[PDB]
Amino acid sequence: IRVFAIPPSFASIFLTKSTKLTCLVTDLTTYDSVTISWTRQNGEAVKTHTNISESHPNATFSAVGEASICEDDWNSGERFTCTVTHTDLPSPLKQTISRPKGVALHRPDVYLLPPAREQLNLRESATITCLVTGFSPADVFVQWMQRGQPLSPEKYVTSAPMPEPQAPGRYFAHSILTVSEEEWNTGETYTCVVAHEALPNRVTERTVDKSTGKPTLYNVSLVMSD
Amino acid sequence: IRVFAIPPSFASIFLTKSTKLTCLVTDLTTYDSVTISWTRQNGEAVKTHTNISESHPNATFSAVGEASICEDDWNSGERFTCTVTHTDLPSPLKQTISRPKGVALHRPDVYLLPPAREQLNLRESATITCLVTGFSPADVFVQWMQRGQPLSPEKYVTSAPMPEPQAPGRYFAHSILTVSEEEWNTGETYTCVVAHEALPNRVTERTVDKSTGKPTLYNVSLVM
Amino acid sequence: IRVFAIPPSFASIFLTKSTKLTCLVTDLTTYDSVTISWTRQNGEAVKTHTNISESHPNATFSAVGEASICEDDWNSGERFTCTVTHTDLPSPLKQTISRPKGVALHRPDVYLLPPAREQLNLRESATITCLVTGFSPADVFVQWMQRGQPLSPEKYVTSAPMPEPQAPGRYFAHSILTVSEEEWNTGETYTCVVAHEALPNRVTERTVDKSTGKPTLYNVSLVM
Ligand SMILES: *[C@@H]1O[C@H](CO)[C@@H](O)[C@H](O)[C@H]1NC(C)=O
Ligand SMILES: *[C@@H]1O[C@H](CO)[C@@H](O)[C@H](O)[C@H]1NC(C)=O
Numbered sequence: 001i002r003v004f005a006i007p008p009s010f011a012s013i014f015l016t017k018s019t020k021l022t023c024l025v026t027d028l029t030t031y032d033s034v035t036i037s038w039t040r041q042n043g044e045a046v047k048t049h050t051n052i053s054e055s056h057p058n059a060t061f062s063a064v065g066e067a068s069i070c071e072d073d074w075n076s077g078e079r080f081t082c083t084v085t086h087t088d089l090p091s092p093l094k095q096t097i098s099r100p101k102g103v104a105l106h107r108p109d110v111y112l113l114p115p116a117r118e119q120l121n122l123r124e125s126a127t128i129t130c131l132v133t134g135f136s137p138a139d140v141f142v143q144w145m146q147r148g149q150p151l152s153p154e155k156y157v158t159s160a161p162m163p164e165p166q167a168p169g170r171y172f173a174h175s176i177l178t179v180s181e182e183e184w185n186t187g188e189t190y191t192c193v194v195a196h197e198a199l200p201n202r203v204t205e206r207t208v209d210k211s212t213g214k215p216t217l218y219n220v221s222l223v224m225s226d
Numbered sequence: 227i228r229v230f231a232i233p234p235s236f237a238s239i240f241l242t243k244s245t246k247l248t249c250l251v252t253d254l255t256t257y258d259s260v261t262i263s264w265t266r267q268n269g270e271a272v273k274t275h276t277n278i279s280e281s282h283p284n285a286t287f288s289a290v291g292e293a294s295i296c297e298d299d300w301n302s303g304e305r306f307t308c309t310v311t312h313t314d315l316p317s318p319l320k321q322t323i324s325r326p327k328g329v330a331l332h333r334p335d336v337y338l339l340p341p342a343r344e345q346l347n348l349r350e351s352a353t354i355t356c357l358v359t360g361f362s363p364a365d366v367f368v369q370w371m372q373r374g375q376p377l378s379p380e381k382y383v384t385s386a387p388m389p390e391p392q393a394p395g396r397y398f399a400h401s402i403l404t405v406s407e408e409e410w411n412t413g414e415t416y417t418c419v420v421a422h423e424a425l426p427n428r429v430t431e432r433t434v435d436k437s438t439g440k441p442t443l444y445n446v447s448l449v450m
Numbered sequence: 451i452r453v454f455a456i457p458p459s460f461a462s463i464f465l466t467k468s469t470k471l472t473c474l475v476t477d478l479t480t481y482d483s484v485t486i487s488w489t490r491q492n493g494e495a496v497k498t499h500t501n502i503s504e505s506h507p508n509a510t511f512s513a514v515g516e517a518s519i520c521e522d523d524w525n526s527g528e529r530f531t532c533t534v535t536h537t538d539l540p541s542p543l544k545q546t547i548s549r550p551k552g553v554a555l556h557r558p559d560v561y562l563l564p565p566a567r568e569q570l571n572l573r574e575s576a577t578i579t580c581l582v583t584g585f586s587p588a589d590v591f592v593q594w595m596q597r598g599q600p601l602s603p604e605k606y607v608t609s610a611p612m613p614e615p616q617a618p619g620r621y622f623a624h625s626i627l628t629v630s631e632e633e634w635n636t637g638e639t640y641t642c643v644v645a646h647e648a649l650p651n652r653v654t655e656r657t658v659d660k661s662t663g664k665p666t667l668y669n670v671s672l673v674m
């Protein structure tokens with residue numbers, strides 16, 4: 001009998017821009033006459049929940065609450081609790097979610113790496129990496145754009161934040177993408193954009209193409225008696 | 227009343243070449259004098275395990291048995307069963323474990339990338355990455371060999387065998403490694419040793435130095 | 451009246467991954483109803499011995515069989531026993547074999563050399579050499595590779611572990627590989643891979659090709 005609470009997430013906030021908070025209840029029998037409500041840091045009235053979920057595959061009930069908040073009061077570090085009154089449990093279950101933060105903040109650093117040439121020999125596909133390092137906290141967002149139109153999410157894949165061995169509590173992440181060498185050997189910018197809270201504009205991007213090196217080759221033809 | 231066992235992983239094997247099967251008896255009341263045992267497919271007796279574990283600080287007792295077999299037998303697939311006997315446990319319990327032979331077999335193609343040029347400006351650190359793509363099945367093992375002696379795994383980080391979006395039956399992995407700039411500027415071939423059970427010798431290596439990949443600037447042509 | 455066996459060897463382990471044991475008989479009059487007993491140090495027996503050989507054509511006798519033991523026992527030092535029974539003498543003939551551990555475990559050093567300049571003028575064949583030096587004991591198991599495809603062992607020849615002239619406790623070997631010049635003129639990376647027991651991963655490979663001898667900084671030319 002445990003209740004999982006999801007605070008607002010950076011990825012959903014940036015993608016949908018319809019900030020939502022939801023806590024789901026687990027390990028409860030398939031009963032009814034159970035109401036779920038949300039409370040703020042002051043425990044004020046909230047919005048009615050919608051989109052009731054179906055029971056778990058192992059024959060236990062499940063439900064999700066819905067409400068709306070704002071960044072101006074979420075960022076203050078205040079707590080948020082959802083009230084669940086299960087029929088079986090006389091004591092209602094309350095879960096608290098907030099953001100203590102107050103941690104060493106720093107801007108993420110973004111680097112792109114062009115595909116290796118030994119991959120660019122069999123002439124099937126190439127992979128481009130976008131390494132985001134030295135950022136705290138977690139909940140960063142990455143997506144790839146080709147000439148303005150974002151790529152279909154089924155194409156690229158992203159890692160998950162993990163600690164840095166040479167930095168106390170500073171995270172790290174990866175992101176790769178595959179394009180045909182047919183397209184690569186012609187031209188495209190393939191921008192990688194990262195959305196993190198610590199950035200001054202919250203958004204930075206860095207792009208790379210096939211012609212980003214070639215440091216001014218030189219040809220000399222000494223001629224004698226010819 | 228949770229029973230589990232840890233089959234010997236590929237990394238567990240190659241880390242010490244000391245394949246061994248252990249049983250996880252956790253989420254039970256803290257007790258003493260607990261008996262764990264194994265068996266073969268035909269019911270033959272097993273070797274005398276020892277070096278049992280202790281209780282968790284979370285009011286839980288962990289029992290670990292050290293059962294050792296040979297890699298030939300384990301690959302042949304001798305079906306084992308962790309039998310745990312204790313005063314509190316009412317009845318014996320059985321668990322079956324093996325490998326589902328019949329998986330797709332493919333060779334992991336390894337590509338090695340140098341650090342970013344824009345990173346090599348702060349003169350602080352570099353992150354060389356070892357990308358292993360298009361293998362089958364999972365559980366690949368990667369280590370970082372500078373030259374000669376190996377390096378501790380507390381200073382480099384490895385990903386998990388995440389599935390490849392383009393290749394479903396195939397997978398991929400990422401292994402990074404930090405180093406100060408002065409070490410990157412005096413050689414340090416920094417090879418990446420990766421071992422998978424589909425390569426003919428089960429081990430392969432790749433190397434990349436700072437003076438690698440640089441194109442040919444001059445094209446002198448003496449004329450006479 | 452002498453009986454000599456064949457201990458398992460490092461190269462025979464890597465060449466087949468089908469380890470066996472063979473104990474041979476010689477200097478005894480040919481006979482029948484001769485059985486060789488295969489019991490371990492602890493006294494228990496092993497799988498039967500097959501492939502009964504034919505007596506040597508020099509008025510002597512021989513017998514060979516097959517076994518299967520995982521290398522954990524051999525590394526631990528489990529003394530295998532081949533008790534041949536002969537009608538020449540009533541007392542059974544018992545012999546055992548083992549391995550020592552008092553050996554310097556230095557690592558081998560591998561160098562490749564390209565074909566001679568004058569050989570690449572007659573335009574018929576070329577020979578490429580892989581050299582090993584400075585190891586102990588005698589466990590080289592050197593083989594060749596191209597494009598990830600193993601080559602037939604007929605095309606390359608390996609030498610014995612000849613000792614060093616100066617170094618007292620070190621040995622060396624050699625290996626050549628004949629190859630067509632027109633094939634050698636278009637890539638064919640042609641790596642050689644050694645496998646000793648003092649190597650941390652027990653496998654090491656080096657490679658050389660045509661482009662191995664270029665400054666990768668400039669391309670001088672002579673046009674007329
Ligand atoms: C390089 O120099 C040679 C000699 O002058 C000349 O024949 C050749 O065309 C030059 N290559 C380029 C790309 O200019
Ligand atoms: C280098 O010069 C040679 C002639 O000396 C020419 O064949 C070749 O195309 C040149 N390389 C490039 C990249 O143009």
Ligand SMILES: *[C@@H]1O[C@H](CO)[C@@H](O)[C@H](O)[C@H]1NC(C)=O
Binds near residue numbers: 669
């Ligand atoms: C260098 O010159 C030789 C001789 O003309 C030519 O075969 C070779 O392709 C050249 N290399 C490059 C990179 O142009």
